[PDB]
Amino acid sequence: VRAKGIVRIPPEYFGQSVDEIAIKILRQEYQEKLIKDIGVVLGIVNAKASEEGFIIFGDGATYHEVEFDMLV
Amino acid sequence: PVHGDKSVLHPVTVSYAFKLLIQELMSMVISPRLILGEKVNLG
């Protein structure tokens, strides 16, 4: 299954490679129970996130669009 | 309050004065239905 979602890279994880940080955040958020629909599986393989990321009012973190592998 | 447990609810940060206004309008027969939207710009 191909899923594209927005990942919130916090300011302290700046200067590291985007892909590893994004996959770490996705694994932390989606390690188990997935979401209510499209399965409850715990599997996740990898991801690739775009370099450019948005900055929103009141938040210093950077929001990147990333496509990733689940194991539904 | 209406949907029970079957619906999903999202947190929104607003002024409590606006919530008071919404509840005072709801004490009337006015029915304000707040429409949520993505916090990110999405695009």
């Binding site: 191909r2 594209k4 979602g5 919130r8 499209i38 599997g43 194991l71 539904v72 | 916090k39 990110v40």
Partner: peptide
Amino acid sequence: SYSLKTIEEHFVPYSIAKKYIKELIDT
């Protein structure tokens, strides 16, 4: 902040699920 959209979804391979979980454990 977390908008999930599934595109071109593929079925979970039962035979290759062991390989996928082994790769995940390796990672």
